Design a protein around this ligand. Structure first.
Ligand code: G18
Ligand code: ZN
Length: 200
């Protein structure tokens, strides 16, 4: 399948060297991709496309949709119930939103919790090469995205906007991040099962 080879290529090509030296997500240059499953949840898809149409109408007939990664210990709940701002990451740089990355390795830092938590449930290892991890590769409606470089604790999108884009800056972010404040603005399209690989 070419659709899944495209997803594997985005997963592999967006890995970056992290400033924390692998503390949160583990030490690796690449992944062993085990499975890529397309999520087909009609009710969530309709909730997503309904909101996408509304955002497009409010953003010069443009949804500003992007495919982005999301890491969480709650990926199974997300696939069944959808993203939910009532469970937003309050401690985030941009406040109470749902965070996405264009770099798979940034999302990998969140798979076992904030700052990687205590790592895998079996070995309590943030750099476990044994346990299988899951990431989501999502359709995200950004609409009119508010560009921000420094911490700005929001409860909702800035007035007239549909999302926040965190841009890299000297004093701030190493890599971009994208924040929505309404769960219906993302669809968990692909579930990726993988392992991080021990460097060569
Ligand atoms: O993929 C992400 N998952 C989660 S879960 C709590 C925070 C984040 C997060 C933060 C910045 C960029 C990506 C992510
Ligand atoms: Zn493990």
């Amino acid at each position: 399948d070419k659709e899944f080879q495209s997803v594997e290529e985005e997963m592999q090509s967006t890995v970056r060297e992290h400033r924390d030296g692998g503390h949160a997500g583990g030490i690796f240059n690449r992944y062993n991709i085990l499975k890529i499953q397309k999520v087909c949840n009609k009710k969530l898809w309709e909730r997503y496309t309904h909101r996408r149409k509304e955002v497009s109408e409010e953003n010069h007939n443009h949804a500003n949709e992007r495919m982005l990664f999301h890491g969480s210990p709650f990926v199974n709940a997300i696939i069944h119930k959808g993203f939910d701002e009532r469970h937003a990451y309050i401690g985030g740089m941009f406040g109470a939103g749902i965070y996405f990355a264009e770099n798979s390795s940034k999302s990998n830092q969140y798979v076992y919790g904030i700052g990687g938590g205590t790592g895998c449930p079996v070995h309590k290892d943030r750099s476990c090469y044994i346990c299988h991890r899951q990431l989501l590769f999502c359709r995200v409606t950004l609409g009119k995205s508010f560009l921000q470089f420094s911490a700005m604790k929001m409860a909702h999108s800035p007035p007239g906007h549909h999302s926040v884009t965190g841009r890299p800056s000297v004093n701030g972010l190493a890599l971009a991040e994208y924040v929505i404040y309404r769960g219906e603005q993302a669809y968990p399209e692909y579930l990726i099962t993988y392992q991080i690989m021990r460097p060569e």
